[PDB]
Design a protein around this ligand. Structure first.
Ligand SMILES: Cc1ncc(COP(=O)(O)O)c(CN)c1O
Ligand SMILES: Cc1ncc(COP(=O)(O)O)c(CN)c1O
Lengths: 282, 280
């Protein structure tokens, strides 16, 4: 198909990554994933804002404005003729002879973006999924969505091998987030989740779900909870751009309540659905 | 020059990295740096053993045996006519459509290796350097020499900005290692350095230095020391394949003892020197 390369949408074959691209040697870069529904991008501006915020945290200067980045994503969706799926885009410090310290400010960051056709996870949304607990051994700046994703890779692989969908990470027995999602717990009609500090990524879907809870008049408490407390929740679910609101019904062979999707998860899902881009008559 | 791309030696210009190489999207790979002295590779078997150990820790199966890999490195040095400098090489899990979990075991690892002429840091080995303390916020698996190096990048740049040569890292005041080196402290002729656990990289230069210490009958204690204890050391130095034995004479304005390279550091440097290749 076509790939965004810096500021040009070019055929995939034209793209050339250099061996000393800092993203290849130090994982020196940041990324974002945006869901596209029937041709329209969901919450694109929030993701672009976060891309800039992550880049800014590690002192990378994106050479163009948010408006130009947005136009390029639009063009990218159109050229690839993406119906339902997602856009993946990343920015690295640039190509420079291998050295740990930042290169001279004359080095231009490398931007890469591409699309993939991928359906909404129907079965998962309806039946819920199994999860497993994995110790969070990642670095202390999890608030930065960088390319240093080796801990997440190891965690997801561990979940996958046990037949689970997601690994629920925990630092010092406190549940932080999943390897590629945020974690939510429901107890007596109250919504709980780890606050957005350096221990987790402040997911866009996480914010959309909290906004949804406020809308259905559901109390939200951003307080962390332990593994022991999670297993005692009435409901539990994970959120991500691609997972939306995916119910977790079992953790390591222990059912969350009766092993069925809860009433509040369902409500939150119905409210989330009103935000997804759709026509008016088609 | 020429680059080692998998098992072939190709001209730099021909090497192309796929946008979906896991090393590019997840830092999913491991690397080594081997010093070359007058055409001879220093402690190559040790770096090769460590490359395979690092790969094994994150379950990457390198398609070549150590003998083939050794043979390939030699060809690389020869083709590039490397006299004194280093070889950099890495292995990533391979190219696959973006997904966090491992690809189908059919996917092959991508191997990249290249050389660079680079003289010994003679000026620093004699004069010593300045360092600064930076909180270690890296992950808990520092024993794996992976491409996830953003923590070391930020630490090196902070030191670089204060005019310092290396950032000495610490976990809640306990000294671990440097951004790209291991830290050693000397007090009353006794050598101190953080033990080789999940908190640091088990440097090859570090192990050579400890071997040098055993050779000159200097007591070695692998016990962690605090940032405050380090400032009260008689001597201090960092080691890395490229830094060899670099004396640290000042940390954050506070000089170590007198700000002169100590006597034991000098004895270690001399014993180290007996090991580096010096053919005519
Ligand atoms: C570590 C981590 N946490 C949470 C998320 C989910 O955030 P978002 O809702 O913005 O997809 C992701 C990205 N999928 C992630 O990589
Ligand atoms: C974190 C870390 N510690 C120590 C070292 C130096 O050890 P070696 O002698 O094996 O280069 C390095 C060099 N890459 C390093 O990155």
């Amino acid at each position: 198909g076509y790939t965004l390369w810096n500021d040009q949408i070019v055929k995939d074959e034209e793209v050339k990554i250099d061996k000393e691209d800092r993203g290849y040697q130090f994982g020196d870069g940041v990324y974002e994933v945006v869901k596209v529904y029937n041709g329209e991008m969901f919450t694109v501006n929030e993701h672009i804002d976060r891309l800039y915020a992550s880049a800014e945290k590690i002192r990378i200067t994106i050479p163009y404005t948010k408006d130009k980045f947005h136009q390029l994503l639009h063009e990218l969706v159109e050229k690839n003729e993406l119906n339902t799926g997602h856009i993946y885009f990343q920015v690295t410090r640039g190509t420079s002879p291998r050295a740990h310290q930042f290169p001279e400010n004359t080095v231009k960051p490398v931007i890469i973006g591409y699309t993939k056709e991928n359906p909404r996870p129907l079965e998962n949304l309806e039946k819920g999924v199994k999860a497993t607990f994995v110790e969070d051994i990642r670095w202390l700046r999890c608030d930065i969505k960088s390319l240093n994703l080796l801990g997440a890779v190891l965690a997801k692989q561990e979940a996958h091998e046990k037949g689970c969908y997601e690994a629920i990470l925990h630092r010092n027995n406190t549940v932080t987030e999943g390897s590629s999602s945020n974690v939510f717990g429901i107890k007596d009609g109250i919504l709980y989740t780890h606050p957005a500090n350096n221990m987790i990524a402040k997911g866009i879907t996480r914010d959309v779900v909290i906004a949804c809870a406020n809308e259905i008049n559901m109390p939200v408490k951003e307080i962390p909870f332990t593994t022991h407390e999670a297993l005692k929740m009435d409901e539990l679910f994970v959120t991500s751009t691609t997972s939306e609101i995916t119910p977790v019904i079992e953790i390591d062979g222990k059912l969350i309540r009766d092993g069925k999707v809860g009433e509040w998860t369902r409500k939150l899902q119905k409210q989330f659905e009103t935000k997804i881009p759709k026509p008016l008559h088609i």
